[PDB]
Amino acid sequence: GSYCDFCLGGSNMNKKSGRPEELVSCADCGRSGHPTCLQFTLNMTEAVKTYKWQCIECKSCILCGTSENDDQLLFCDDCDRGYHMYCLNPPVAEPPEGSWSCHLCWELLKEKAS
């Protein structure tokens, strides 16, 4: 019986929308989070359910599995991964102008084929 760190409604009712939604969870804590409250998308939402999404401050740069220079550590908008902008295949250098995406979604974009 947990709740999301944003509205703190629960995995059956969202106190930010008023809709029932399963709560996500962190790996270092286990804190829940509504993919909607989290600003996720069906992709991020699903992704977090696939692995250990972790709760932001735990969301280490999957690339380094550290989070050290988190000052750059972006958060994918298709899975919610963690990438220090200078770890990315095409290093960001500075927070993307628009929507940023990690390699997982892309790898998924190709592998999705037969």
């Binding site: 600003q39 750059q72 958060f75 102008e97």
Partner: peptide
């Protein structure tokens, strides 16, 4: 994109700063 720092890892509300 929101980085793990000042971006508060959350969509804020825009910022007055036209890209050079």
């Amino acid at each position: 994109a929101r980085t793990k720092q000042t971006a508060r890892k959350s969509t804020g509300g825009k910022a007055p700063r036209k890209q050079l």
